[PDB]
Amino acid sequence: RNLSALKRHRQSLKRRLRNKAKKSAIKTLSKKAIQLAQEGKAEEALKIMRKAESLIDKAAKGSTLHKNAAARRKSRLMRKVRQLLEAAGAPLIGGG
Amino acid sequence: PKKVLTGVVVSDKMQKTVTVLVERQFPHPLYGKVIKRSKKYLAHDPEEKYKLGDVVEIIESRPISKRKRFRVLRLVESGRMDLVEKYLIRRQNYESLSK
Amino acid sequence: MVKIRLARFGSKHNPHYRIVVTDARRKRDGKYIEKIGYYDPRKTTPDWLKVDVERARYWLSVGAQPTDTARRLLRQAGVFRQ
Amino acid sequence: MIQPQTYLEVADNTGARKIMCIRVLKGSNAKYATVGDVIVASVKEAIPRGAVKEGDVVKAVVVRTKKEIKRPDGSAIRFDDNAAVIINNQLEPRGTRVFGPVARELREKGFMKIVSLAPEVL
RNA sequence: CCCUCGCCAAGGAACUCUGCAAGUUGGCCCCGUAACUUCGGGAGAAGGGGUGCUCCCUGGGGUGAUGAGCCCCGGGGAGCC
RNA sequence: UUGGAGAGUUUGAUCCUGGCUCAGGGUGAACGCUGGCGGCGUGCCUAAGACAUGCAAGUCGUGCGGGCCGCGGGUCCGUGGUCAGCGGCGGACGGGUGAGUAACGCGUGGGUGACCUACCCGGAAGAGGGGGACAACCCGGGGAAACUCGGGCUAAUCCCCCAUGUGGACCCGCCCCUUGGGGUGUGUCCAAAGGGCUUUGCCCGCUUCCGGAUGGGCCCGCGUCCCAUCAGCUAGUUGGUGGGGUAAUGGCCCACCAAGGCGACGACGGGUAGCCGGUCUGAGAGGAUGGCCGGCCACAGGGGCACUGAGACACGGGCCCCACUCCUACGGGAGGCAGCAGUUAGGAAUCUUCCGCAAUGGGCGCAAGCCUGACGGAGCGACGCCGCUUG
RNA sequence: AGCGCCGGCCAACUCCGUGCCAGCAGCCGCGGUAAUACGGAGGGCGCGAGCGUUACCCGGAUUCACUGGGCGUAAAGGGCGUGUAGGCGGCCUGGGGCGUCCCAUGUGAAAGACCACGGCUCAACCGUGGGGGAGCGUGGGAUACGCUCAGGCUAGACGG
RNA sequence: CCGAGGGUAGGGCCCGUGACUGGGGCGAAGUCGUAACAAGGUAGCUGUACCGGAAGGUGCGGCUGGAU
Ligand SMILES: [Mg+2]
Ligand SMILES: [Mg+2]
Ligand SMILES: [Mg+2]
Ligand SMILES: [Mg+2]
Ligand SMILES: [Mg+2]
Ligand SMILES: [Mg+2]
Ligand SMILES: [Mg+2]
Ligand SMILES: [Mg+2]
Ligand SMILES: [Mg+2]
Ligand SMILES: [Mg+2]
Ligand SMILES: [Mg+2]
Ligand SMILES: [Mg+2]
Ligand SMILES: [Mg+2]
Ligand SMILES: [Mg+2]
Ligand SMILES: [Mg+2]
Ligand SMILES: [Mg+2]
Ligand SMILES: [Mg+2]
Ligand SMILES: [Mg+2]
Ligand SMILES: [Mg+2]
Ligand SMILES: [Mg+2]
Ligand SMILES: [Mg+2]
Ligand SMILES: [Mg+2]
Ligand SMILES: [Mg+2]
Ligand SMILES: [Mg+2]
Ligand SMILES: [Mg+2]
Ligand SMILES: [Mg+2]
Ligand SMILES: [Mg+2]
Ligand SMILES: [Mg+2]
Ligand SMILES: [Mg+2]
Ligand SMILES: [Mg+2]
Ligand SMILES: [Mg+2]
Ligand SMILES: [Mg+2]
Ligand SMILES: [Mg+2]
Ligand SMILES: [Mg+2]
Ligand SMILES: [Mg+2]
Ligand SMILES: [Mg+2]
Ligand SMILES: [Mg+2]
Ligand SMILES: [Mg+2]
Ligand SMILES: [Mg+2]
Ligand SMILES: [Mg+2]
Ligand SMILES: [Mg+2]
Ligand SMILES: [Mg+2]
Ligand SMILES: [Mg+2]
Ligand SMILES: [Mg+2]
Ligand SMILES: [Mg+2]
Ligand SMILES: [Mg+2]
Ligand SMILES: [Mg+2]
Ligand SMILES: [Mg+2]
Ligand SMILES: [Mg+2]
Ligand SMILES: [Mg+2]
Ligand SMILES: [Mg+2]
Ligand SMILES: [Mg+2]
Ligand SMILES: [Mg+2]
Ligand SMILES: [Mg+2]
Ligand SMILES: [Mg+2]
Ligand SMILES: [Mg+2]
Ligand SMILES: [Mg+2]
Ligand SMILES: [Mg+2]
Ligand SMILES: [Mg+2]
Ligand SMILES: [Mg+2]
Ligand SMILES: [Mg+2]
Ligand SMILES: [Mg+2]
Ligand SMILES: [Mg+2]
Ligand SMILES: [Mg+2]
Ligand SMILES: [Mg+2]
Ligand SMILES: [Mg+2]
Ligand SMILES: [Mg+2]
Ligand SMILES: [Mg+2]
Ligand SMILES: [Mg+2]
Ligand SMILES: [Mg+2]
Ligand SMILES: [Mg+2]
Ligand SMILES: [Mg+2]
Ligand SMILES: [Mg+2]
Ligand SMILES: [Mg+2]
Ligand SMILES: [Mg+2]
Ligand SMILES: [Mg+2]
Ligand SMILES: [Mg+2]
Ligand SMILES: [Mg+2]
Ligand SMILES: [Mg+2]
Ligand SMILES: [Mg+2]
Ligand SMILES: [Mg+2]
Ligand SMILES: [Mg+2]
Ligand SMILES: [Mg+2]
Ligand SMILES: [Mg+2]
Ligand SMILES: [Mg+2]
Ligand SMILES: [Mg+2]
Ligand SMILES: [Mg+2]
Ligand SMILES: [Mg+2]
Ligand SMILES: [Mg+2]
Ligand SMILES: [Mg+2]
Ligand SMILES: [Mg+2]
Ligand SMILES: [Mg+2]
Ligand SMILES: [Mg+2]
Ligand SMILES: [Mg+2]
Ligand SMILES: [Mg+2]
Ligand SMILES: [Mg+2]
Ligand SMILES: [Mg+2]
Ligand SMILES: [Mg+2]
Ligand SMILES: [Mg+2]
Ligand SMILES: [Mg+2]
Ligand SMILES: [Mg+2]
Ligand SMILES: [Mg+2]
Ligand SMILES: [Mg+2]
Ligand SMILES: [Mg+2]
Ligand SMILES: [Mg+2]
Ligand SMILES: [Mg+2]
Ligand SMILES: [Mg+2]
Ligand SMILES: [Mg+2]
Ligand SMILES: [Mg+2]
Ligand SMILES: [Mg+2]
Ligand SMILES: [Mg+2]
Ligand SMILES: [Mg+2]
Ligand SMILES: [Mg+2]
Ligand SMILES: [Mg+2]
Ligand SMILES: [Mg+2]
Ligand SMILES: [Mg+2]
Ligand SMILES: [Mg+2]
Ligand SMILES: [Mg+2]
Ligand SMILES: [Mg+2]
Ligand SMILES: [Mg+2]
């Protein structure tokens, strides 16, 4: 009736927490910056947008994000913010 | 290579897409005779430059939509509405094969 | 890893291996990447060993990993001689 | 308060879905059946190829009722449907599972087998 | 006690010659709708969803003048009890 | 040119047409009568019915901290075994089966400027400084079991934080290219874990990048059965725009817009079937077939789902619903042999609850080595072929 | 040492018993008192740890006919026109080279099959080497015929 | 939101079965006649129509695959 598969389920539950928690944050921040960039509010958008990008690549270190996801999330994050600031300018920090 | 095919446009009624009909011959695998078979491909035309009646070449491409896996390669001939007739008349006969 | 090893052919109480390069995840007697020699353990013929040496050196360069009892039959044909 | 004509749900896996009471087996002229009482019924609706089929005249013990039953401790319990379990002449279920809760009253009346098979007893 | 009327536990036609009587159903908008047919129909078949108020965006018409006001027919979004 | 036989039977008789029938080869066979030996094969074709019991996946103390026992000897240290636990790596392979599927599933040839790839190899550089959790253990409550609740503490190759930037990622501009390919400039962002010995030197690990190799995803041309007494089918339908999602393209998912898409070259519908290498027959052409072996696919009681992960939507992992069975102390719990054997049902019918890791192979490990119903062999059966005997 | 068979197809013949019975049977057919055809027997034929039956596949079946059939009377011409799609199409010249044909090259896994050899005392089984292929991709070529485009013609067709 | 499935209601296709009923095949040891084969004793066959216990008959039109 036994196994260390039990062990392996025990672990997955814990990795699941760390993952979800990490991904939650990325969306919270990305959207936060995108929100700011709409009403931009350019310095702040850019400020939060950096905090996102950092957290994304941080996730791509592990099992959370495959590298190409991180790339992709970053690509779409940036595009949105920039093109949003085009409806008023101008970029107060970096970047870029 | 990317497969390349030549055929007549029979529809322009989609936006940014043409229906290109490609025809082919081959001997009957048992009865020998050379036989024709045809097939419609939805070909990508981002430029809405291809008209009904054009004879064109299409090249297999990365998938554009469900069902569209070809972009239009180039014009070859224009104004082959006689081909388009052959197709259109055939569909119109179908109203007469029912019950 | 991709591996160099011994696929058993022949028959019962009558082994006949094909020293072969295959993915480790294959089954023993399964589709192999490339054949590179054979080996009769019962030694019942003059050349109970044959090894393309020119080939086995390639795979090693490119990262193949021979089994223990294949490493040897690569020693015996001096694929390793420096 | 089950009486002839009352339809009951059947809470087992005999294949019967619905039964119509035709008699309450409690003496010569009992008007109503409650929890723990046996009725005779007609099978009005059943699923294909079960132990029992539409038309069969079966016995059943009532196991939950929409009229509340009262208890000597001053409480009462009430279920959302009237349901019964089909039995044989030795008060044993003819099915092998029973679905839904049943009334504890069943135990004191010797429907021990049904009481255990039940997911809950209230 | 009778008339006219309101409610009713569990049951639900077991009432009775007979569901007699009384319930149920119930307008409008939308979805959807069988046998059979003289091709009209059967059809409101059946069955089902919607229905108040508040705010915001928006389409067409009448009267004006082409506009405002007034009146008519809507559509989409977010909510409140 | 290595290859091609026909016969009986319609008549009083004949010729012809024409059907029936036979001799031949084949098989996962079965049945009868009979039955000595050996070798290689080979054996649930039916209920993808239901299954008692063992066994089929684990390993590393050279990641970590502990208990329990013992060995060593002055409470402690060491050393060893064992037992969990935290941490890796395996568990996605290998084994089963053929239910579903008429489909890009498979076969064959191609495309990816639209893509991934653990361990393996080649090459570029690098490991500075902090902090934290949770188990194990102690302490409480709850059971017949399955078992778990909460309080507290502690280690690390666990987690996090900053530093560092060969590199790498992303937006904008520019150059080459030409679907998202290669390079560059500014901006921003991302690394790490140490263990061990013979100890200023090794070994195994750790980190980011490039390329190889290998295994994959997706896409396209052509091929793939019966019924037209199935002739019309289609609203995510066909295309578009934007976005969501993924490793990646795509109506794969959504919002909006347009009115399209398919079909006698057979859509739609019904039926049947996993496909191939092959196999069997046949002069050939063809017909029939897909058992064993190899390739791919699909499935894991019937369904749905995602988590973990390089990789699964995971046969012996998880969640939920259903059907069925069992356990109980009657409160409550458990299971999934289409892995190897074995039982039962069904059937004309189909095996030993064997032996071993010695060999080949696979997993973990520096290694010794541990596990392996893969496999190597043995057992039963005239099931097949081959050999041999009763002189 | 067994098993099938001994009318014809088909290799293997006599005696008894039975008497349209009991029975055989793949087809044609046997049995009604002299049965090589039933049952037994002697004998014979065929194979032999096998023989025979049932089932199914291909063959014989040119009996779905591509190879390789047919339609007055054997089964088979639509009751007759008109005509859509399709299939097919006269003479001459050029252009293109789609069919077609040739060369090169990639692919066409392993096993199996085929030829050689070799290992188990043979074989079966098994190993080593050899031979190729259709079919698809790529490159180059040919242009008779079919195709396509272009220009001529008059014997088909149509008109005066 | 979507969602296994569950529930309600109405449809389509297919299999099994059913009082009874329609013919069909066969058997054969019957009843009734004798329609076809000969000019088959009314030449036959035919599409259709009406009719008869039954083969069949008759009408209309057609065919010769009709004897003399
Ligand atoms: Mg473990
Ligand atoms: Mg939030
Ligand atoms: Mg990662
Ligand atoms: Mg992941
Ligand atoms: Mg698109
Ligand atoms: Mg009934
Ligand atoms: Mg009441
Ligand atoms: Mg009530
Ligand atoms: Mg009622
Ligand atoms: Mg009711
Ligand atoms: Mg009554
Ligand atoms: Mg009464
Ligand atoms: Mg009435
Ligand atoms: Mg009334
Ligand atoms: Mg009313
Ligand atoms: Mg009303
Ligand atoms: Mg009323
Ligand atoms: Mg109806
Ligand atoms: Mg009516
Ligand atoms: Mg009508
Ligand atoms: Mg209504
Ligand atoms: Mg309503
Ligand atoms: Mg509302
Ligand atoms: Mg009002
Ligand atoms: Mg109000
Ligand atoms: Mg007015
Ligand atoms: Mg106005
Ligand atoms: Mg005869
Ligand atoms: Mg005759
Ligand atoms: Mg005769
Ligand atoms: Mg004949
Ligand atoms: Mg036998
Ligand atoms: Mg025997
Ligand atoms: Mg099976
Ligand atoms: Mg069954
Ligand atoms: Mg069972
Ligand atoms: Mg074991
Ligand atoms: Mg280590
Ligand atoms: Mg040990
Ligand atoms: Mg341990
Ligand atoms: Mg597998
Ligand atoms: Mg096997
Ligand atoms: Mg299958
Ligand atoms: Mg189908
Ligand atoms: Mg296809
Ligand atoms: Mg393909
Ligand atoms: Mg891994
Ligand atoms: Mg610490
Ligand atoms: Mg950093
Ligand atoms: Mg939409
Ligand atoms: Mg898009
Ligand atoms: Mg993935
Ligand atoms: Mg879709
Ligand atoms: Mg087609
Ligand atoms: Mg057809
Ligand atoms: Mg089916
Ligand atoms: Mg199947
Ligand atoms: Mg032949
Ligand atoms: Mg098959
Ligand atoms: Mg088979
Ligand atoms: Mg296989
Ligand atoms: Mg499934
Ligand atoms: Mg499942
Ligand atoms: Mg099962
Ligand atoms: Mg399941
Ligand atoms: Mg698993
Ligand atoms: Mg699972
Ligand atoms: Mg799966
Ligand atoms: Mg597996
Ligand atoms: Mg299992
Ligand atoms: Mg207890
Ligand atoms: Mg529980
Ligand atoms: Mg078990
Ligand atoms: Mg049996
Ligand atoms: Mg068995
Ligand atoms: Mg075996
Ligand atoms: Mg081993
Ligand atoms: Mg080993
Ligand atoms: Mg190792
Ligand atoms: Mg074992
Ligand atoms: Mg014989
Ligand atoms: Mg013979
Ligand atoms: Mg003879
Ligand atoms: Mg007698
Ligand atoms: Mg005699
Ligand atoms: Mg005879
Ligand atoms: Mg005789
Ligand atoms: Mg012959
Ligand atoms: Mg033939
Ligand atoms: Mg035949
Ligand atoms: Mg022919
Ligand atoms: Mg003929
Ligand atoms: Mg005739
Ligand atoms: Mg004619
Ligand atoms: Mg006609
Ligand atoms: Mg024509
Ligand atoms: Mg032509
Ligand atoms: Mg010509
Ligand atoms: Mg020409
Ligand atoms: Mg050409
Ligand atoms: Mg070739
Ligand atoms: Mg080959
Ligand atoms: Mg020899
Ligand atoms: Mg060979
Ligand atoms: Mg050949
Ligand atoms: Mg020419
Ligand atoms: Mg011309
Ligand atoms: Mg002329
Ligand atoms: Mg639903
Ligand atoms: Mg549903
Ligand atoms: Mg449910
Ligand atoms: Mg009848
Ligand atoms: Mg009858
Ligand atoms: Mg007459
Ligand atoms: Mg007469
Ligand atoms: Mg006459
Ligand atoms: Mg007449
Ligand atoms: Mg009469
Ligand atoms: Mg008359
Ligand atoms: Mg005439």
PDB file of all heavy atoms in Angstrom, chain F residues 103-106 224 275 297:
ATOM      1  P     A F 103     -12.081  11.222 -41.870  1.00  0.00           P
ATOM      2  OP1   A F 103     -13.313  11.845 -41.338  1.00  0.00           O
ATOM      3  OP2   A F 103     -11.851  11.442 -43.322  1.00  0.00           O
ATOM      4  O5'   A F 103     -10.885  11.614 -40.885  1.00  0.00           O
ATOM      5  C5'   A F 103     -11.118  12.370 -39.712  1.00  0.00           C
ATOM      6  C4'   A F 103      -9.864  12.525 -38.886  1.00  0.00           C
ATOM      7  O4'   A F 103      -9.460  11.233 -38.370  1.00  0.00           O
ATOM      8  C3'   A F 103      -8.633  13.049 -39.612  1.00  0.00           C
ATOM      9  O3'   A F 103      -8.552  14.449 -39.571  1.00  0.00           O
ATOM     10  C2'   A F 103      -7.490  12.430 -38.850  1.00  0.00           C
ATOM     11  O2'   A F 103      -7.304  13.187 -37.659  1.00  0.00           O
ATOM     12  C1'   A F 103      -8.066  11.071 -38.485  1.00  0.00           C
ATOM     13  N9    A F 103      -7.910  10.027 -39.522  1.00  0.00           N
ATOM     14  C8    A F 103      -8.106  10.090 -40.885  1.00  0.00           C
ATOM     15  N7    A F 103      -7.998   8.920 -41.480  1.00  0.00           N
ATOM     16  C5    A F 103      -7.755   8.028 -40.446  1.00  0.00           C
ATOM     17  C6    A F 103      -7.565   6.644 -40.442  1.00  0.00           C
ATOM     18  N6    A F 103      -7.573   5.924 -41.571  1.00  0.00           N
ATOM     19  N1    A F 103      -7.354   6.040 -39.252  1.00  0.00           N
ATOM     20  C2    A F 103      -7.347   6.822 -38.164  1.00  0.00           C
ATOM     21  N3    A F 103      -7.522   8.140 -38.018  1.00  0.00           N
ATOM     22  C4    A F 103      -7.720   8.686 -39.232  1.00  0.00           C
ATOM     23  P     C F 104      -7.957  15.202 -40.841  1.00  0.00           P
ATOM     24  OP1   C F 104      -8.198  16.671 -40.642  1.00  0.00           O
ATOM     25  OP2   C F 104      -8.428  14.464 -42.061  1.00  0.00           O
ATOM     26  O5'   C F 104      -6.402  14.889 -40.772  1.00  0.00           O
ATOM     27  C5'   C F 104      -5.604  15.290 -39.669  1.00  0.00           C
ATOM     28  C4'   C F 104      -4.410  14.380 -39.544  1.00  0.00           C
ATOM     29  O4'   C F 104      -3.772  14.270 -40.836  1.00  0.00           O
ATOM     30  C3'   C F 104      -3.325  14.800 -38.555  1.00  0.00           C
ATOM     31  O3'   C F 104      -2.862  13.646 -37.853  1.00  0.00           O
ATOM     32  C2'   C F 104      -2.217  15.345 -39.459  1.00  0.00           C
ATOM     33  O2'   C F 104      -0.912  15.184 -38.947  1.00  0.00           O
ATOM     34  C1'   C F 104      -2.389  14.501 -40.705  1.00  0.00           C
ATOM     35  N1    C F 104      -1.919  15.121 -41.943  1.00  0.00           N
ATOM     36  C2    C F 104      -0.771  14.603 -42.522  1.00  0.00           C
ATOM     37  O2    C F 104      -0.196  13.681 -41.910  1.00  0.00           O
ATOM     38  N3    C F 104      -0.328  15.131 -43.692  1.00  0.00           N
ATOM     39  C4    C F 104      -1.020  16.124 -44.247  1.00  0.00           C
ATOM     40  N4    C F 104      -0.593  16.644 -45.386  1.00  0.00           N
ATOM     41  C5    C F 104      -2.200  16.657 -43.672  1.00  0.00           C
ATOM     42  C6    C F 104      -2.622  16.122 -42.530  1.00  0.00           C
ATOM     43  P     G F 105      -3.409  13.295 -36.373  1.00  0.00           P
ATOM     44  OP1   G F 105      -4.735  12.649 -36.585  1.00  0.00           O
ATOM     45  OP2   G F 105      -3.298  14.496 -35.458  1.00  0.00           O
ATOM     46  O5'   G F 105      -2.468  12.088 -35.938  1.00  0.00           O
ATOM     47  C5'   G F 105      -2.794  11.261 -34.854  1.00  0.00           C
ATOM     48  C4'   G F 105      -2.937   9.817 -35.254  1.00  0.00           C
ATOM     49  O4'   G F 105      -4.113   9.633 -36.058  1.00  0.00           O
ATOM     50  C3'   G F 105      -1.851   9.211 -36.105  1.00  0.00           C
ATOM     51  O3'   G F 105      -0.661   8.925 -35.397  1.00  0.00           O
ATOM     52  C2'   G F 105      -2.542   7.977 -36.665  1.00  0.00           C
ATOM     53  O2'   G F 105      -2.598   6.955 -35.688  1.00  0.00           O
ATOM     54  C1'   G F 105      -3.952   8.504 -36.886  1.00  0.00           C
ATOM     55  N9    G F 105      -4.157   8.944 -38.266  1.00  0.00           N
ATOM     56  C8    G F 105      -4.285  10.267 -38.600  1.00  0.00           C
ATOM     57  N7    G F 105      -4.476  10.437 -39.881  1.00  0.00           N
ATOM     58  C5    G F 105      -4.456   9.149 -40.405  1.00  0.00           C
ATOM     59  C6    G F 105      -4.592   8.755 -41.750  1.00  0.00           C
ATOM     60  O6    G F 105      -4.775   9.500 -42.725  1.00  0.00           O
ATOM     61  N1    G F 105      -4.528   7.373 -41.887  1.00  0.00           N
ATOM     62  C2    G F 105      -4.346   6.500 -40.849  1.00  0.00           C
ATOM     63  N2    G F 105      -4.305   5.215 -41.214  1.00  0.00           N
ATOM     64  N3    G F 105      -4.204   6.851 -39.577  1.00  0.00           N
ATOM     65  C4    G F 105      -4.273   8.198 -39.428  1.00  0.00           C
ATOM     66  P     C F 106       0.737   9.141 -36.153  1.00  0.00           P
ATOM     67  OP1   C F 106       1.823   8.832 -35.187  1.00  0.00           O
ATOM     68  OP2   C F 106       0.691  10.470 -36.831  1.00  0.00           O
ATOM     69  O5'   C F 106       0.708   8.012 -37.271  1.00  0.00           O
ATOM     70  C5'   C F 106       0.751   6.647 -36.889  1.00  0.00           C
ATOM     71  C4'   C F 106       0.428   5.767 -38.056  1.00  0.00           C
ATOM     72  O4'   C F 106      -0.808   6.214 -38.651  1.00  0.00           O
ATOM     73  C3'   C F 106       1.415   5.820 -39.201  1.00  0.00           C
ATOM     74  O3'   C F 106       2.524   4.983 -38.988  1.00  0.00           O
ATOM     75  C2'   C F 106       0.577   5.396 -40.388  1.00  0.00           C
ATOM     76  O2'   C F 106       0.416   3.996 -40.388  1.00  0.00           O
ATOM     77  C1'   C F 106      -0.761   6.034 -40.048  1.00  0.00           C
ATOM     78  N1    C F 106      -0.885   7.353 -40.668  1.00  0.00           N
ATOM     79  C2    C F 106      -1.259   7.377 -42.004  1.00  0.00           C
ATOM     80  O2    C F 106      -1.460   6.284 -42.541  1.00  0.00           O
ATOM     81  N3    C F 106      -1.373   8.581 -42.632  1.00  0.00           N
ATOM     82  C4    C F 106      -1.132   9.718 -41.955  1.00  0.00           C
ATOM     83  N4    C F 106      -1.255  10.890 -42.589  1.00  0.00           N
ATOM     84  C5    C F 106      -0.744   9.696 -40.573  1.00  0.00           C
ATOM     85  C6    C F 106      -0.626   8.501 -39.963  1.00  0.00           C
ATOM     86  P     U F 224      -6.443   6.254 -51.973  1.00  0.00           P
ATOM     87  OP1   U F 224      -7.205   5.287 -52.813  1.00  0.00           O
ATOM     88  OP2   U F 224      -6.835   7.686 -52.051  1.00  0.00           O
ATOM     89  O5'   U F 224      -6.492   5.589 -50.514  1.00  0.00           O
ATOM     90  C5'   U F 224      -6.149   4.217 -50.308  1.00  0.00           C
ATOM     91  C4'   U F 224      -6.171   3.836 -48.845  1.00  0.00           C
ATOM     92  O4'   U F 224      -5.102   4.526 -48.140  1.00  0.00           O
ATOM     93  C3'   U F 224      -7.434   4.193 -48.058  1.00  0.00           C
ATOM     94  O3'   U F 224      -8.493   3.260 -48.221  1.00  0.00           O
ATOM     95  C2'   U F 224      -6.929   4.286 -46.616  1.00  0.00           C
ATOM     96  O2'   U F 224      -6.917   3.016 -45.988  1.00  0.00           O
ATOM     97  C1'   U F 224      -5.490   4.797 -46.806  1.00  0.00           C
ATOM     98  N1    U F 224      -5.455   6.258 -46.593  1.00  0.00           N
ATOM     99  C2    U F 224      -5.065   6.776 -45.364  1.00  0.00           C
ATOM    100  O2    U F 224      -4.663   6.087 -44.437  1.00  0.00           O
ATOM    101  N3    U F 224      -5.120   8.151 -45.262  1.00  0.00           N
ATOM    102  C4    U F 224      -5.530   9.035 -46.234  1.00  0.00           C
ATOM    103  O4    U F 224      -5.546  10.245 -46.022  1.00  0.00           O
ATOM    104  C5    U F 224      -5.931   8.413 -47.450  1.00  0.00           C
ATOM    105  C6    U F 224      -5.887   7.090 -47.591  1.00  0.00           C
ATOM    106  P     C F 275      -6.032  -1.251 -39.006  1.00  0.00           P
ATOM    107  OP1   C F 275      -6.953  -1.541 -40.129  1.00  0.00           O
ATOM    108  OP2   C F 275      -5.521  -2.426 -38.248  1.00  0.00           O
ATOM    109  O5'   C F 275      -4.836  -0.362 -39.515  1.00  0.00           O
ATOM    110  C5'   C F 275      -5.064   0.618 -40.499  1.00  0.00           C
ATOM    111  C4'   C F 275      -3.820   1.419 -40.758  1.00  0.00           C
ATOM    112  O4'   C F 275      -3.361   1.983 -39.516  1.00  0.00           O
ATOM    113  C3'   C F 275      -2.591   0.683 -41.293  1.00  0.00           C
ATOM    114  O3'   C F 275      -2.615   0.525 -42.694  1.00  0.00           O
ATOM    115  C2'   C F 275      -1.499   1.630 -40.909  1.00  0.00           C
ATOM    116  O2'   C F 275      -1.600   2.752 -41.777  1.00  0.00           O
ATOM    117  C1'   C F 275      -1.964   2.060 -39.526  1.00  0.00           C
ATOM    118  N1    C F 275      -1.456   1.162 -38.481  1.00  0.00           N
ATOM    119  C2    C F 275      -0.165   1.383 -38.047  1.00  0.00           C
ATOM    120  O2    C F 275       0.437   2.324 -38.579  1.00  0.00           O
ATOM    121  N3    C F 275       0.365   0.598 -37.085  1.00  0.00           N
ATOM    122  C4    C F 275      -0.364  -0.385 -36.599  1.00  0.00           C
ATOM    123  N4    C F 275       0.172  -1.143 -35.671  1.00  0.00           N
ATOM    124  C5    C F 275      -1.688  -0.632 -37.015  1.00  0.00           C
ATOM    125  C6    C F 275      -2.207   0.165 -37.952  1.00  0.00           C
ATOM    126  P     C F 297       4.282   7.901 -31.305  1.00  0.00           P
ATOM    127  OP1   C F 297       4.515   9.315 -30.887  1.00  0.00           O
ATOM    128  OP2   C F 297       4.857   6.825 -30.452  1.00  0.00           O
ATOM    129  O5'   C F 297       2.710   7.658 -31.463  1.00  0.00           O
ATOM    130  C5'   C F 297       1.899   8.583 -32.166  1.00  0.00           C
ATOM    131  C4'   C F 297       0.556   8.000 -32.491  1.00  0.00           C
ATOM    132  O4'   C F 297       0.711   6.676 -33.032  1.00  0.00           O
ATOM    133  C3'   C F 297      -0.419   7.794 -31.344  1.00  0.00           C
ATOM    134  O3'   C F 297      -1.060   8.985 -30.978  1.00  0.00           O
ATOM    135  C2'   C F 297      -1.389   6.804 -31.938  1.00  0.00           C
ATOM    136  O2'   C F 297      -2.260   7.464 -32.845  1.00  0.00           O
ATOM    137  C1'   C F 297      -0.447   5.919 -32.748  1.00  0.00           C
ATOM    138  N1    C F 297      -0.050   4.735 -31.983  1.00  0.00           N
ATOM    139  C2    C F 297      -1.024   3.780 -31.737  1.00  0.00           C
ATOM    140  O2    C F 297      -2.185   3.946 -32.154  1.00  0.00           O
ATOM    141  N3    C F 297      -0.671   2.697 -31.026  1.00  0.00           N
ATOM    142  C4    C F 297       0.571   2.565 -30.591  1.00  0.00           C
ATOM    143  N4    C F 297       0.856   1.463 -29.902  1.00  0.00           N
ATOM    144  C5    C F 297       1.569   3.535 -30.845  1.00  0.00           C
ATOM    145  C6    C F 297       1.228   4.603 -31.546  1.00  0.00           C
TER     146        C F 297
END
